[PDB]
Amino acid sequence: MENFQKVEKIGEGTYGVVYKARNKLTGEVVALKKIRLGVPSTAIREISLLKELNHPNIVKLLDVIHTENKLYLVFEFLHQDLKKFMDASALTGIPLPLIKSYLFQLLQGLAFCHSHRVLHRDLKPQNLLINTEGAIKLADFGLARAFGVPVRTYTHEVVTLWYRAPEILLGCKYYSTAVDIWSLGCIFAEMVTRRALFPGDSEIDQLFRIFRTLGTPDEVVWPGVTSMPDYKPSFPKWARQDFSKVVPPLDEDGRSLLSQMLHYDPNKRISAKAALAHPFFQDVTKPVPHLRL
């Protein structure tokens, strides 16, 4: 539209292409997501919902514009995503106080969403955006299957399984807020180690990498697991590996928190609100990253 002047393409999302743009009138600089293609009532009002969802740690959805066979999502613009910051910090690692600040802020964001009855569903470093003032924000919230598959985007681009909760992988249709805690645990481990916790290249490889590390789940640690739609008694039975080899050299408070975020049983997995009270955050501060923009 002529409301916005394209600056550059900044990404190709899971629903459409994203541009940096400026409001041709106000001069405001925003991120503009363009999705080609009635618009589902299921969607049209769960999206207009997301506009009400305002929090310092959630990327502000400024406007939703349905026009000429397209839907535009107008967002506040941030400096950089977490994935880029992680790749640029790979030599020395992100300093623990910054890791801790980011984790704390994201748990605040999640606690807010979840208390509002909103799930993200697709948490990953790519979907987290940061600024110069040390803030980190949840971006590109996943739609409830309003867009599922459908096969792909109406466009190209492969999807990451690395942060998917095991109950999703096992066919649970009615998964809960616990799925975001799982993904955030995986992101936490990755910030610490500089390397993806569970980098699977297929759904079964993803599952089996989780099992190989955390032990194949059974009715002891996860009641009802063997009755899950995609569970197979033929799954190999791996022993749980000791947790100290998983995220060294993270301290015991960190490891304790992470283990509670990676509980197999979604009903025993720690909540975002309870995680905020974990001793790990007793000395939490808000450092600023050094950002090359």
Which CATH number belongs to the domain containing residue 234 in this structure? 1.10.510.10
Element containing residue 207 per DSSP (H, E): helix 203-214
The enclosing domain of 72 has a CATH number of 3.30.200.20
Catalytic residues: 122
Give me the phi and psi of 93, to 5 degrees please: 85, 155
In whole angstroms, give the CA distance from residue 191 to residue 195.
7
How are beta strands 70-76 and 80-81 bridged, if at all? unpaired
Strand partners, 66: 71
Same-domain status, 134 and 144 = yes
Query: To what resolution in angstroms was this structure determined?
Result: 2.0
Same domain, 70 and 207: no
Both 111 and 6 in a single domain?
A: no
Q: Up-side HSE of residue 233: CA atoms within 13 Å toward CB? A: 0
**In this structure, how many other beta carbons lie within 10 angstroms of the beta carbon of residue 290?**
10
Q: Are 259 and 91 in contact (CB under 8 A)?
A: no
Question: Which distant-in-sequence residues (6+ apart) come within 8 Å of 220 by Cβ?
Answer: none
Query: 214-218 long-range CB contacts below 8 Å, 24 or more apart?
Result: 214/240, 214/241, 214/262, 214/264, 215/239, 215/240, 215/241, 217/166, 217/264
Q: Which helix (H) or strand (E) holds 136?
A: strand 136-138
Residue 206 shares a structural domain with residue 116 = yes
Q: Give yes or no for a contact between 136 and 82, defined as CB atoms under 8 angstroms apart.
A: yes
SS3 4: strand
> Which of 50, 79, 108 is the C-terminal boundary of a domain?
79
Q: How many domains does the chain have?
A: 2
Q: Tell me: do 140 and 39 sit in the same domain.
A: no
81 has binding-site annotation: yes
> How was this one solved?
X-ray
| Residue 158, number of CB atoms within 10 A of its CB | 7
Q: Is 18 annotated as a binding-site member?
A: yes
Containing structural domain, residue 42: 1-79
Final residue belonging to a domain, choices 48, 79, 110: 79
User: Are 110 and 157 members of one domain?
Assistant: yes
Closest CA to 284 of 87, 107, 132: 107
Residue 76 annotated as part of some ligand binding site:
yes
Measured distance CA(143)–CA(20) in Å, rounded: 22
163 is in an annotated binding site: no
Burial string for 166-200 (b: 16+ CB within 10 Å, else e) reads: bbbbbebeebebbbbbbbbbbbbbbbbeeebbbeb
DSSP label of 193: H
Backbone angles phi, psi at 271, to 5 degrees: -85, 165
Regarding whether 97 and 53 lie in a shared domain, the answer is no
140 is in an annotated binding site: yes
**Could you tell me if 42 and 178 lie in one domain?**
no
Tokens (6 digits) for 218: 């059974």
